A paper describes a structure:
The recycling of Trx is catalysed by the homodimeric flavoprotein [name] (TrxR) that utilizes electrons from NADPH which are shuttled through a tightly bound FAD co-enzyme and a redox active dithiol motif. [name], an industrially important LAB model bacterium, contains a TrxR that recycles two Trx (TrxA and TrxD) as well as NrdH, a glutaredoxin-like protein providing electrons to ribonucleotide reductase class Ib13. The overall structure of LlTrxR is similar to other low molecular weight (LMW) TrxRs317 with a dimeric organization in which each monomer is composed of NADPH and FAD binding domains. While investigating the biochemical properties of [name] TrxR (LlTrxR) we discovered that the enzyme is susceptible to photo-inactivation by visible light in an oxygen-dependent manner.
The LlTrxR structures were obtained mainly in the FR conformation, which was unexpected since all available structures of LMW TrxR from other organisms are in the FO conformation, except for the engineered complex between EcTrxR and EcTrx6. The propensity of LlTrxR to crystallize in the FR conformation may indicate that the enzyme is stabilized in this conformation. Superposition of LlTrxR Cα-atoms with the structure of EcTrxR36, gives RMSD of 0.426 Å and 1.137 Å for the enzymes in FR and FO conformation, respectively. The relative orientation of the structures thus matches perfectly with the E. coli enzyme and consolidates the catalytic model proposed by Waksman et al. (1994) where the NADPH domain rotates 66° relative to the FAD domain in order to switch between the FO and FR conformations in the catalytic cycle. Tyr237 is only close to the isoalloxazine ring when LlTrxR is in the FR conformation, suggesting that photo-oxidation reactions are primarily taking place while the enzyme is in this conformation. The re-face of the isoalloxazine ring in the FO conformation is occupied by the Cys134-Cys137 disulfide while in the FR conformation it is surrounded by hydrophilic residues (Asp154, Glu158, Ser155 and Gln285). Met43 positioned on the si-face bends away from the isoalloxazine towards Pro15 and the sidechains of Met18 and Met67 and as a consequence a pocket on the si-face is formed. In the space between the β-carbon of Met43 and the isoalloxazine ring (7.2–7.4 Å distance to N10 and N5) a well-defined electron density appears, assigned to a water molecule perfectly centered above the central ring of the isoalloxazine. This water molecule is present in all structures listed in Table 1. The water is in hydrogen bond distance from the 2′-ribityl hydroxyl group (2.8 Å) and the alcohol group of Thr46 (2.8 Å), and the distance from the water to the N5 and N10 atom of the isoalloxazine is 3.5–3.6 Å.
Author numbering:
A (entry chain A), B (entry chain A): 5 to 307
The structure:
Amino acid sequence: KYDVVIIGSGPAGMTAAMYTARSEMKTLLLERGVPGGQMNNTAEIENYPGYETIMGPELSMKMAEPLEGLGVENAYGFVTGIEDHGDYKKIITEDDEFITKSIIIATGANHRKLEIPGEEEYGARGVSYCAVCDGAFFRNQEILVIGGGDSAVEEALYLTRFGQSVTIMHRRDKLRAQEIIQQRAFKEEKINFIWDSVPMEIKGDDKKIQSVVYKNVKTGEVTEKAFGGIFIYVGLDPVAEFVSDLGITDEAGWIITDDHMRTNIPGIFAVGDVRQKDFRQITTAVGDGAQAAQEAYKFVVEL
Amino acid sequence: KYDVVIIGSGPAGMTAAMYTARSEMKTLLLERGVPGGQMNNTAEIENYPGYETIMGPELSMKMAEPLEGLGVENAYGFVTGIEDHGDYKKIITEDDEFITKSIIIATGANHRKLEIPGEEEYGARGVSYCAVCDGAFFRNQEILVIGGGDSAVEEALYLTRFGQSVTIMHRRDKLRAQEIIQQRAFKEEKINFIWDSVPMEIKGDDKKIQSVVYKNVKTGEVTEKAFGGIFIYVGLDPVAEFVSDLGITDEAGWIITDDHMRTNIPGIFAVGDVRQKDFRQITTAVGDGAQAAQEAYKFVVEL
Ligand SMILES: Cc1cc2nc3c(=O)[nH]c(=O)nc-3n(C[C@H](O)[C@H](O)[C@H](O)COP(=O)(O)OP(=O)(O)OC[C@H]3O[C@@H](n4cnc5c(N)ncnc54)[C@H](O)[C@@H]3O)c2cc1C
Ligand SMILES: Cc1cc2nc3c(=O)[nH]c(=O)nc-3n(C[C@H](O)[C@H](O)[C@H](O)COP(=O)(O)OP(=O)(O)OC[C@H]3O[C@@H](n4cnc5c(N)ncnc54)[C@H](O)[C@@H]3O)c2cc1C
Ligand SMILES: NC(=O)c1ccc[n+]([C@@H]2O[C@H](COP(=O)([O-])OP(=O)(O)OC[C@H]3O[C@@H](n4cnc5c(N)ncnc54)[C@H](OP(=O)(O)O)[C@@H]3O)[C@@H](O)[C@H]2O)c1
Ligand SMILES: NC(=O)c1ccc[n+]([C@@H]2O[C@H](COP(=O)([O-])OP(=O)(O)OC[C@H]3O[C@@H](n4cnc5c(N)ncnc54)[C@H](OP(=O)(O)O)[C@@H]3O)[C@@H](O)[C@H]2O)c1
């Protein structure tokens, strides 16, 4: 009944859907939340070719805008599973079932947790995984950011609009982030560093975070310091629960594809951050997306 | 002396250069003409995520704009060869030589010729490979477009702004172009079709094209019809002469890479239309580009 169903309307899925529709495939794009995925949790995007800078949510809007006019069927759905029935597949949401000849999985990735005490307890209360969502709640605080990669360092620079200071805690003596972002963090006066450290505990009164305990990973020295907010940016986990049974994920849960975005399962493709890969960006999400769209077109042509 | 040299400033090369520079690689971007590559020969771009529609040359400008500010070294150069010297490489232009630790080849593809009589003769004179360049020269003419793929059909729709009529000649009974583009050509009143045919000869007086002779590929019937212009869009050839000796091309001249954009030759990567692949688009040029940039960064880190 559908030629293609695409799960997830971040930039990879939205690009796929734009292509399947231009190919006049009967196209359903399922999204559990707001179109844009992670781009909506991004303050400022500087490295998407075509725009010198653009707010995450504006880029999200621009990419979603033409889909309806192309005849993409945009629907709300949280997908809970996928059943393969050889010459077709069933996708199960909370309420519905959807029959399709092919699937492009574009469900991305989610924040990795610290799994330390106080992290859950203070979830609503000074612990955040999204600077653009929560930063203004921490005006004039001492903010802590945990992590050393592009999200930690970039989101720390953003958080300097709000905090008295922002401190980046990284578990080595060298950041992983892009040099230009590093260099911008080195130079920014409101950014402090706690190198070679990991957090051990988040502590607070009954209402909110007050301090963090942390350990130096070369000496074992333990320190506790006061902070009003903690943003955690220590990497990503796949968002692929609905396919765990299917034999298409690696040991860590990422979807395995070949270079044409194909899983084991004919007619089931995956794109973007959810795939097992190293280089997660909007550019590679968009490319993966277009590639999947084309492979699905071909797959459906042969069916 | 360079960490990376990128040859070609179309969207693939310009994306690569934006990434190498953000990685603070000492970056040279060589281009023989105007930044934008094929996008400059494109009238209207509708399928680049982020823009609902945008003129080829405007998208070119936007992608070129931030490169200087990132510290990309933008230079004029036509590259004639590349010499590998193990731990470095030499790139030869017409006038200069450039030493670099890595190369990202992003030189794209060029129009395939018909190789029929009158095609060279009337080159300046009613034969064109670029509708956006020459279309207005053919106001009120009967225009012919040869080809059945996305460029023929899309450039024919554009040419309808200028011609009395535009006729698409395709060598089968089914277009290769995207269905949406087909459907738009079917519906457009100024677009005629000559199906199942190939052109045999382009004829003219001393000053210009007047007619085309063509053959039906199922019956052998030969017909000659009057036209004032002919646009030829019958596919692409690689632009990779400077590496022919190097053992990195297939029998047709396309550069062979793996999925991380690597050739045989360590430190020599290729991206975009110049690679051996099937799916040539701005989205996949941009993705390939970002991927190469990252692989080059890593390659140079290990050197
Ligand atoms: C703070 C931050 C800043 C970033 N900045 C940049 C940047 O500047 N440049 C850059 O190139 N990259 C950036 N990235 C990375 C980039 O945003 C991602 O690589 C990209 O968004 C991946 O797109 P995707 O479509 O694969 O996944 P996502 O954007 O993660 O989209 C996945 C979508 O699937 C939906 N979903 C998940 N599960 C289900 C389900 N079961 N059913 C229905 N829907 C589901 C989600 O709601 C989501 O909308 C940044 C990331 C972060 C966190
Ligand atoms: C008419 C037309 C319309 C199109 N429309 C679309 C569209 O709507 N959407 C879409 O996604 N795709 C479209 N495409 C395809 C798209 O433009 C290409 O896939 C894309 O431009 C490839 O980019 P690239 O950087 O790999 O190569 P190119 O854009 O071809 O750039 C290669 C660059 O290398 C330079 N160069 C070549 N040799 C040398 C040398 N020896 N030394 C120095 N410089 C050199 C050239 O000057 C050129 O600037 C279209 C193509 C055409 C012809
Ligand atoms: N502008 C952009 O292009 C942009 C922006 C944001 C994200 N992204 C991309 O998105 C993907 C994910 O980015 P990310 O930064 O969220 O994740 P990431 O690249 O996995 O980096 C997470 C960082 O946190 C560190 N870390 C892990 N556990 C830690 C702990 N317990 N304490 C302190 N530090 C810890 C890691 O250490 P190690 O480094 O030692 O492993 C790493 O530096 C990447 O591919 C990234 O490039 C891109
Ligand atoms: N909007 C876009 O996304 C866009 C726009 C333009 C180009 N592109 C991409 O650019 C790449 C190249 O596009 P293209 O259209 O230039 O080339 P193409 O896809 O190779 O198509 C060339 C077309 O011309 C036909 N042909 C070849 N020789 C012929 C002859 N002698 N007489 C009549 N017809 C002949 C081919 O026939 P067969 O079909 O029988 O082989 C084919 O249909 C493609 O990957 C394309 O998708 C994309």
